[PDB]
């Protein structure tokens, strides 16, 4: 987050737009409390049998 | 019996939606005014 905040001061419009999009995902993870490594599955849930009868 | 019908409760298709979202590895939880969890499955699906 601290690196992306420094790139937010660049004169180029494209650089500031790209750093904002990366920061939005980083901010969402920091505020929610989720961990980024939870996006890779280790155990797969199984639906209850009555909903797949 | 000649009475007025009682108050309704949670529909079953909403319970199906919660379970199907849990099969997608998404944690969906119903909360109350104080942000405390509310159990809509009558304790039938909680591991003791």
**Which distant-in-sequence residues (6+ apart) come within 8 Å of A24 by Cβ?**
none
d(CA B20, CA B18): 6
Two tokens at A38? 């939870």
Q: Contact A39/A17 with Cβ under 8 angstroms? A: no
| Inter-chain touch B22–A48, beta carbons under 8 Å | no
**Cβ count near A12 (within 10 Å):** 9
Method of elucidation: cryo-EM
To the nearest whole angstrom, how far is the Cα of B25 from the nearest Cα of chain A? Answer: 7
Chain A nearest CA to B1, separation (Å): 33
- Cα(B16)–Cα(B10) distance, rounded to whole angstroms? 11
Strand partners, A15: none
């Amino acid at each position: 987050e601290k690196e992306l905040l420094e790139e937010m001061k660049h004169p180029s419009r494209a650089r500031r737009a790209k750093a904002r999009k990366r920061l939005e995902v980083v901010r969402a993870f920091l505020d929610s409390g989720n961990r980024p490594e939870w996006m890779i599955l280790e155990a797969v849930p199984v639906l209850p049998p009555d909903l797949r009868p | 019996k000649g009475e007025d019908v009682p108050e309704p409760s949670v529909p079953e298709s909403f319970r199906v939606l919660v379970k199907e979202l849990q099969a997608l590895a998404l944690d969906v939880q119903t909360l109350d005014e104080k942000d405390n969890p509310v159990d809509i499955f009558e304790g039938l699906a909680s591991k003791r």
